Amino acid sequence: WIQXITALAPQAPAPF
């Protein structure tokens, strides 16, 4: 679950 969020960390700014 820490690598589910950290792999999405650079994918938070590109949509939002």
CA angle in degrees (0–180, nearest 5) for 15-5-12: 15
Show contacts of 8-16: CB within 8 Å, 24+ apart: none
For the chain, counts of helices (H) and of strands (E): 1, 0
> SS3 breakdown of the chain: % helix, strand, coil, rounded to 5?
60, 0, 40
> Residues of 1-16 as b/e, b for ≥16 C-beta within 10 angstroms?
eeeeeeeeeeeeeeee
Report angle CA 3, 8, 5 to the nearest 5 degrees: 40
**The length of the chain, given as a count of residues:** 16
Method: NMR
Rounded Cα–Cα distance for residues 16 and 3 (Å): 20
Q: How far is CA 15 from CA 2, 11, in A?
A: 20, 7
